[PDB]
Design a protein around this ligand. Structure first.
Ligand SMILES: Nc1nc2c(ncn2[C@@H]2O[C@H](COP(=O)(O)OP(=O)(O)O)[C@@H](O)[C@H]2O)c(=O)[nH]1
Ligand SMILES: [Ca+2]
Ligand SMILES: [Ca+2]
Ligand SMILES: [Mg+2]
Lengths: 31, 153, 30
């Protein structure tokens, strides 16, 4: 269960979508 | 216990207004429903509906849905069918935790009476609550009853 | 309109707050 790293302001929409999916996956397992 | 709630409906019915009144009276709020503490995440669907593979995933994350229409808008009440079909398409389930919401009940001018929406929700098998983001009436009831439906299923 | 990153020392609740923000943002800009 690795905590995902938030991509910078240079990131695209897809990069945020990935981090959105990774954070959801992380916050789910960490519960 | 975490709860993902999604608010859908026609543009201008007051989806954003209902979200603000819940949270700030941020899209997250800790409440207590039926003696059980809850963590509510709200998805306020912005803009107009379009085809999007990632928007579906955003809605697929939702565990409960609010079909919000305006009581002074006939079309917003007619589109309720359209939004429900979309939710069942994305969630891939006929029975999805859902609540029919008639917003702007504070307005004296009404084109959609309560009995019309009462029958529609009755045929769907879902609860129906009249709300008013202006007078904060029924706002909490709409979101909390949605959590009840999720607990039911 | 994009919500700024929570940081390296953001707690779980800080992540839950951010995730809800990014949830609405990613939908709106789609
Ligand atoms: N009287 C009244 N007006 C409302 C209510 N909810 C929203 N509105 C009005 O509707 C306008 C747009 O609503 P909005 O939340 O942005 O629509 P939506 O986000 O597309 O669902 C706002 O300027 C509000 O003044 C309500 O419950 N009562
Ligand atoms: Ca598109
Ligand atoms: Ca688009
Ligand atoms: Mg809105």
């Amino acid at each position: 269960p690795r905590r995902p790293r938030c991509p910078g302001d240079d990131a695209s929409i897809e990069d945020l979508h990935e981090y959105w999916a990774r954070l959801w996956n992380y916050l789910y397992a960490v519960a | 216990t975490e709860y993902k709630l999604v608010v859908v409906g026609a543009v201008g019915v007051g989806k954003s207004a209902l979200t603000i009144q819940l949270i700030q009276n941020s899209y997250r709020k800790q409440v207590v429903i039926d003696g059980e503490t809850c963590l509510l995440d709200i998805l306020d669907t912005a803009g107009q509906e379009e085809y999007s593979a990632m928007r579906d995933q955003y809605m697929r994350t939702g565990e409960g849905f609010l079909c919000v229409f305006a009581i002074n808008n006939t079309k917003s009440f007619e589109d309720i069918h359209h939004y429900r079909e979309q939710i069942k398409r994305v969630k891939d389930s006929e029975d999805v935790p859902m609540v029919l919401v008639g917003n702007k009940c504070d307005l004296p001018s009404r084109t959609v009476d309560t009995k019309q929406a009462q029958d529609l929700a009755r045929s769907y098998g879902i609860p129906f609550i009249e709300t008013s983001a202006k007078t904060r009436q029924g706002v909490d009831d709409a979101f909390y009853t949605l959590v009840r439906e999720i607990r039911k299923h």
